[PDB]
């Protein structure tokens, strides 16, 4: 019956900063029926607070619950390196759904991506499919944009994936792979990858001609 929204989607803060996450509901939720969960990559979720403001056992004092009615906030007074995870709010009165989540990552110096493009291997072309891969390496912030040009032509069928924030360097990496058939691939010459990022003053393009 009731939908939940969280703001922001991703939160970029530094250790020692104060974090304020928001959970907003479409309809009113009683203050005994709102909880907050934390989930680190590859682990099961953990209850942080319940009943809006009450803390669970063994939870440090940085985590503070607040809010009522239709707006609730979770406060992390001073962030620690282990507090960088995904936080979900959960209602349990009329509806029992979780929120979309808020990602809290380490604020780091801006880093532009290292762009690499890889042509299909001759072994792969023996199967009848050509997949060209564009790589964006070790950038921050997480938000980046990749566009494909099979000719100087804009595409509509490719797939991307992005790593979790690295445990050490605190950067992200993204790979976009364009999938074409061998019939389509052999027809065209120049294959280009256009990358847009906050760390780049102007878009970076990496390309290769099929003959090479």
């Amino acid at each position: 019956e009731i939908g939940l929204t969280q703001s922001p989607g991703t939160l970029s803060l530094s250790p020692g900063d104060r974090a304020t996450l928001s959970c907003r509901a479409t309809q009113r939720v009683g203050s005994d029926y709102l909880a907050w969960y934390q989930q680190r990559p590859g682990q099961s979720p953990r209850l942080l607070v319940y009943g809006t403001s009450r803390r669970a056992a063994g939870i440090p004092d940085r985590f503070s619950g607040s809010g009522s009615g239709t707006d609730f906030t979770l406060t992390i007074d001073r962030l620690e390196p282990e507090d960088f995870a995904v936080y979900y709010c959960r209602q349990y009165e009329t509806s029992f759904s979780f929120g979309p989540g808020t990602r809290v990552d380490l604020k780091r110096t801006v880093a532009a991506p290292s762009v690499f493009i890889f042509p299909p291997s001759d072994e792969q072309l023996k199967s009848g499919t050509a997949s060209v891969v564009c790589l964006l390496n070790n950038f921050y912030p997480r938000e980046a944009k990749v566009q494909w040009k099979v000719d100087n032509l804009q595409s509509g069928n490719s797939q991307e994936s992005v790593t979790e924030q690295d445990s050490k360097d605190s950067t992200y990496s993204l790979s976009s792979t364009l999938t074409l058939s061998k019939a389509d691939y052999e027809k065209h010459k120049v294959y280009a990858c256009e990358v847009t990022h906050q760390g780049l003053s102007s878009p970076v393009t990496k390309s290769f001609n099929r003959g090479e």
Binding site: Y88, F98, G101, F116, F118
Partner: protein
């Protein structure tokens, strides 16, 4: 310490059915699709109401989720939850009509100098089912620079993955690079030498 163990998760065809169990030592079931957020299943949810039925035995210490007439969207990691909260470790339920298949490993040959100590190469772990796959470089010697990306589910129902590594451009003439792809569900191990083209 108060612990929970889960079982019953496995590979199931879309039309099929499966039952997963949780024994302890009120209960809630939640799931998580690959790369998405926590979704409450029942303890029913709108997509699973009617097809899923939660049962409970207070004698044999177990909680059951009976998933009947599954769908592709039901593919997730299902969790137990029940003040000290305790959560199980989770067991993955994969729903697909594809059959188990070993990956085809293709080289991402180093080119695109982008030089000054950094060169990029990798492997293309393509067309496999199911998850997961393990990729190591030079039998575990190469660990600094390797990025193994989360798999994407192609339209054919088979996953695809790329694992890249950045190395000093001085070393790619001298040092040889082989990636070790291990797909345990299909009992497949593949080593592919990545050489410049």
């Amino acid at each position: 310490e108060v612990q929970l163990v889960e079982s019953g998760g496995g590979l199931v065809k879309p039309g099929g059915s499966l039952r997963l169990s949780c024994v302890g030592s009120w209960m809630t079931w939640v799931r998580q699709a690959p790369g998405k957020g926590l979704e409450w299943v029942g303890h029913y949810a709108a997509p699973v109401k009617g097809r899923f039925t939660v049962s409970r035995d207070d004698s044999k210490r177990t909680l059951y989720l009976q998933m009947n007439s599954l769908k592709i969207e039901d593919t997730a990691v299902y969790y137990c939850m029940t003040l000290i909260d305790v959560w199980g470790k989770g067991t993955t339920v994969t729903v697909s009509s594809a059959s188990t298949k070993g990956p085809s490993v293709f080289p991402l040959a180093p080119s695109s100098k982008s030089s000054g100590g950094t060169a990029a190469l990798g492997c293309l772990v393509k067309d496999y089912f199911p998850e997961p796959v393990t990729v190591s470089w030079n039998s575990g010697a190469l660990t600094s620079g390797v990025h193994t990306f989360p798999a994407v589910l192609q339209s054919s129902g088979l996953y695809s993955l790329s694992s890249v590594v950045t190395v000093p451009s001085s070393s790619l003439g001298t040092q040889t690079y082989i990636c070790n792809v291990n797909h345990k569900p299909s009992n497949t191990k593949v080593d592919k030498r990545v050489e410049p083209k």
